[PDB]
Amino acid sequence: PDVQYPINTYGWLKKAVALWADRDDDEFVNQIPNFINFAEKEIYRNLRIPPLEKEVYLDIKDGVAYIPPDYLEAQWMMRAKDGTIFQVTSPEEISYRRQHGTNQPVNFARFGSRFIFYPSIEADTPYYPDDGSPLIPAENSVILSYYADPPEFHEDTDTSTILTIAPELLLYFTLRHACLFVQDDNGVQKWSALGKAILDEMVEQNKKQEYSGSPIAIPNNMT
Amino acid sequence: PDVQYPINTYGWLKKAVALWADRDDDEFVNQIPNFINFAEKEIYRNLRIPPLEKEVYLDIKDGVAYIPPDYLEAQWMMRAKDGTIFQVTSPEEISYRRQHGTNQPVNFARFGSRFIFYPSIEADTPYYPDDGSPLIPAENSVILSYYADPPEFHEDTDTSTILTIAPELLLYFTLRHACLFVQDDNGVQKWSALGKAILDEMVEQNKKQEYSGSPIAIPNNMT
């Protein structure tokens, strides 16, 4: 096969992979997609960065506020009102807060598929989103910043930022499972090492991007 | 054989194993369900992740409860109202409280296949059907959260959350025992090392999750 200089996406990548493993037979190609579904997962299982982050409003309603399907991990959480940050704790503490009602430091916790907040908050969303209402961002309610499970590819012309930015990664990491389907293990080691060494670059990029501007270790607030 | 790209059912996985373990013969394919059963039992023996959790209402008669047959490991349990997270103690400690005890916290322990409670709690199951549009919870009930063993497939088109999330997890682990039937000793380590790599990949996705919101200290003081 052949490809274009940039590999925008699947429609070409699933071929370039066959290429980089020169012997592209059918028993092998038709599982290309599977190798890929493996690799992206092996990645996203632990990769965390902005581009997949999300803004979103919530509906607390009795503090049963439910967790979205797409959720993986939360970075921060707050209100659109006066910018109040929540913080997180365990049930074993929030329950005490309940048995000791008197609330400014808002806490919350993870009860199965549920989020609890100590004070009976009432942020809100509309009913199912037929919508017909921006509603000042749903009454400027809490807003969440969380990493979300990206969609598995399902189409050749389908795409993702990753390919705009860092496709060789996917290539190597799927070659990994491709060189496992058929026993060429030295190639495996090489693919894998390179995937990891490509990857850690990204997280370090992000780390060096985070906390820039020389902040003090912690502005000690008295109040 | 041939398999689809979105491997999601036990039926396709059974043929996918015969594809990656490329051999297809009566001496091998007929035992594949046993290999999958071996792989899942090994994985579920120690894996603890939220999607396999379960909510349940108890039937406390007099400070006692019978452990559900599907119970594996216990986590937080609380009252349906006002919270009051329960805590576990030893039989040698709860018995001390009974004889000397003639707002208080709640402690519980395990007597073989039974639960016990010091304050002699009485809880009841939901009132259940009739017209059966809702399932109305009853007052003075308790809610328990525990890890339950997922049912064995025992059926082709049956599916599980593991296949949806990490299909390669069971695929590599069942290749371990597949390479145990025929002594592909080199294959044993490669599937296992990849298998634990995927298996261990589960946990840091989870511990980075329960403490993701805002890592702080312990704001629980007695006052």
Binding site: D62, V64, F111, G112, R114, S120 | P50, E55, S133
Partner: peptide, 27 residues
Amino acid sequence: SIGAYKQAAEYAADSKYWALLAESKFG
């Protein structure tokens, strides 16, 4: 008053069943 997170498919079954009866008697 916080609800637990059981299987999503079961909640979807409760979601549609109650919605179907509510909207049908609504009609």
